C-alpha cells in the first residue's frame, strides 16, 4: 500500500541515516519525498505513532522520537525476548532447503557488507536476514510484532553502525544456531545479540 512506503521508508531511513531522532516531519515534505498523497502520509504517521517511532504534532506534522536511557533499556528488554523467539521459531524451517539457502545467502551478504564498511548494504542484508528468519518460523504473532525487533530509534540514536563487527558475529551465531535446529540454543543466540547491544550502550555511559 502507499501507506506502507512511508511507514517502512521512515523506519528504513532511520537505520540508513536519512531520517534522524528528533527530526521534524512535515506532511508536504513527506508527500514530495515518498511520492504518495496526504491520506497515505497521515495513515503512515498514525501507524508510526502506534509503534512508538513518532509523536504526532499539530498541523498534520510529527517528530521522530528520541529515547531516554531507561526507555532504551525497556525497548531492549522486549527486543531481547522477541529476537530470541524469532531465532527459536525459525528452527522450524531448518530442513526447508530453499529457506536455508536464503538464510546462508543473507549471511554471506552481511559478511561482504561488513568488510566493505557499507552501512547501506549491511542494513539491507540485515533486513533480509530477519525477514528470512521470520518466514522460517511462520509465527503469525511475531509477524505482527516484527517492527519492534528492528529497534530503529535505538539503532540511530545509539550509533549501532559503529558496532557492526560485533553485530555480524552475533548474526552469524544466530544463523548457525537456527540451522542446527535446536530451539533452546537458537533462542539463546537471538537473545545473546540483544544482550551485546545493551552491553555496548551501557559501556559508553
Q: Which listed CATH number (3.30.1330.10, 1.20.120.530, 3.40.50.10320, 1.10.3720.10) goes with 67-205? A: 1.20.120.530
How far is it, in rounded angstroms, from Cα 83 to Cα 32?
A: 35
3-state DSSP assignment of residue 181? coil
Equal fold, 1-66 vs 67-205: no
- Determine whether 163 is exposed, middle or buried from the number of CB atoms within 10 Å of its CB (0-12, 13-18, 19+): middle
How far is it, in rounded angstroms, from Cα 46 to Cα 158?
A: 25
- Considering only CA atoms, which of 78, 91, 81 is closest in space to residue 185? 91
- Considering only CA atoms, which of 171, 178, 166 is closest in space to residue 203? 166
| Location of C-alpha cell 549491511 | 122
| Location of C-alpha cell 544482550 | 195
The pairing of beta strand 62-64 with beta strand 54-56: antiparallel
Are 35 and 6 spatial neighbours (Cβ–Cβ below 8 Å)?
no
How far is it, in rounded angstroms, from Cα 95 to Cα 182?
A: 12
Are 44 and 1 spatial neighbours (Cβ–Cβ below 8 Å)?
no
How far is it, in rounded angstroms, from Cα 54 to Cα 80?
A: 22
Segments making up each domain of the chain, as ranges: 1-66, 67-205
Strand partners, 62: 25, 56
Report the 10 Å Cβ neighbour count for 25: 21
- Considering only CA atoms, which of 159, 170, 198 is closest in space to residue 77? 198
PDB experimental method: X-ray
* Residues in Cβ contact with 185 at an 8 Å cutoff, skipping those fewer than 6 apart: 177
Fold of 1-66: Arc Repressor Mutant, subunit A (1.10.10)
- The count of residues in the chain is 205
Are 48 and 10 spatial neighbours (Cβ–Cβ below 8 Å)?
yes
* First vs last C-alpha separation in the chain: 41
**CA geometry: angle 89, 90, 94, nearest 5 deg:** 125
Report the 10 Å Cβ neighbour count for 59: 6
How far is it, in rounded angstroms, from Cα 13 to Cα 96?
A: 32
Which phi and psi (to 5°) does residue 107 adopt?
-65, -45
CA distances from 66 to 24, 84, 156 (A): 12, 25, 9
Resolution to one decimal, Å: 1.9
Encode burial over 182-204: b for 16+ CB neighbours within 10 A, e otherwise. ebebbbbbbbbbbebbbebbeee
Amino acid at each position: 500500500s502507499a501507506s506502507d512506503t512511508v511507514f517502512f521508508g521512515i523506519m528504513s531511513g532511520l537505520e540508513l541515516g536519512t531520517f534522524v531522532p528528533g527530526q521534524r516531519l512535515v506532511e508536504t515534505d513527506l508527500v514530495a519525498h515518498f511520492g504518495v498523497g496526504r491520506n497515505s502520509v497521515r495513515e503512515a504517521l498514525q501507524r508510526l505513532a502506534a509503534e512508538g517511532i513518532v509523536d504526532l504534532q499539530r498541523h498534520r506534522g510529527a517528530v521522530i522520537r528520541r529515547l531516554s536511557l531507561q526507555e532504551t533499556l525497556d525497548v531492549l528488554d522486549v527486543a531481547e525476548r522477541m529476537t530470541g523467539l524469532l531465532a527459536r521459531a525459525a528452527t522450524r524451517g531448518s530442513g526447508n532447503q530453499p529457506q536455508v539457502q536464503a538464510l546462508r545467502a543473507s549471511v554471506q551478504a552481511l559478511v561482504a557488507a561488513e568488510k566493505a564498511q557499507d552501512g547501506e548494504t549491511f542494513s539491507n542484508a540485515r533486513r533480509h536476514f530477519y525477514r528470512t528468519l521470520l518466514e522460517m518460523g511462520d509465527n503469525r504473532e511475531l509477524r505482527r510484532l516484527f517492527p519492534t525487533i528492528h529497534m530503529p530509534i535505538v539503532h540511530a540514536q545509539h550509533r549501532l553502525a559503529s558496532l557492526r563487527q560485533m553485530r555480524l558475529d552475533d548474526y552469524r551465531r544466530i544463523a548457525t544456531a537456527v540451522l542446527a535446529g535446536e530451539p533452546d540454543a537458537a533462542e539463546a543466540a537471538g537473545a545473546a545479540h540483544v544482550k551485546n547491544v545493551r552491553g555496548a550502550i551501557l559501556d559508553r555511559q
